[PDB]
C-alpha cells in the first residue's frame, strides 16, 4: 500500500513479545528504540542527530514484525525520545520513497 | 521516480540559486538546513532531535527545489548534522512511502 506524509508515518511493531509505536524514518540509518530488554550480546555505540549524541546498546539479528512482514535486523536501544525504524529494516520489508 | 533505501536517500536541492545535498527524511516534521543566508526576517523555533533540543531560525515562504520539483515553504536553519528535507516539503513534492 501507500503511506501519505501529511502526518508522521507511525506503525506498530512486534519485538521481544512487546508492542511498540514507531516512526518509519528514511532519515535514520538504524532502528532506535527506547530502553527495553533484548536477548543476546550487544556492543556500546554512540549515535548523533539534531541535539547531539546519545549512547545506545547495539543488538544484532533481532526479529521484528512490521507492516505484516517478519524482518531481521540491528536494533539500537537507548534514551531516544521516539521509537525509530531505520533504513536497515525498511529495506527488508521492501519500502521505498516514491514521487 | 522511486528511491530505494539501501543507501541514504540524498538528493540535490536548489535554494538561493545554489545546489546542495539533502536527506529525504520522513522522520522529520520540518526541513532543517545547515548554516546559510536566506532573505527576509526570521522567527525563533525550538526543535527536538535524538540528542536533545536546538535553536533554529525559521524562514517562511522560501523557494526551494527538491529533485527538480519546485516548492515554497518553511525552512529552518541551525546546527544539524546534515541538510534534512522534512514532511512539510516532502508533501509539497508528492512524496510518499510505499511497500
Ligand atoms: C545511526 O542511526 C541513527 C538513527 C537515527 C538518527 S536521528 O534520529 O537523529 N535522525 C537522523 C537525522 C537527524 C539526520 C532521524 C531524523 O529523522 C530524526 C528522528 C527523530 C528524532 C527525535 C524525535 C523525532 C524524530 N528527526 C529529526 O531530528 O527531526 C527534527 C526535524 O523536524 C522535527 O521533527 C521532530 C524532530 C525534528 C541518527 C542515527
Swiss-Prot record, chains A, B:
Region (Dimerization of protease): 1-5, 49-55, 88-99
Domain Peptidase A2: 20-89
Active-site residues, record numbering mapped to chain: 25 (for protease activity)
Subunit structure: Homodimer, whose active site consists of two apposed aspartic acid residues.
Function, in words: Aspartyl protease that mediates proteolytic cleavages of Gag and Gag-Pol polyproteins during or shortly after the release of the virion from the plasma membrane. Cleavages take place as an ordered, step-wise cascade to yield mature proteins. This process is called maturation. Displays maximal activity during the budding process just prior to particle release from the cell. Also cleaves Nef and Vif, probably concomitantly with viral structural proteins on maturation of virus particles. Hydrolyzes host EIF4GI and PABP1 in order to shut off the capped cellular mRNA translation.
Record-given protein name: Protease
Organism: Human immunodeficiency virus type 1 group M subtype B (isolate BH10) (HIV-1)
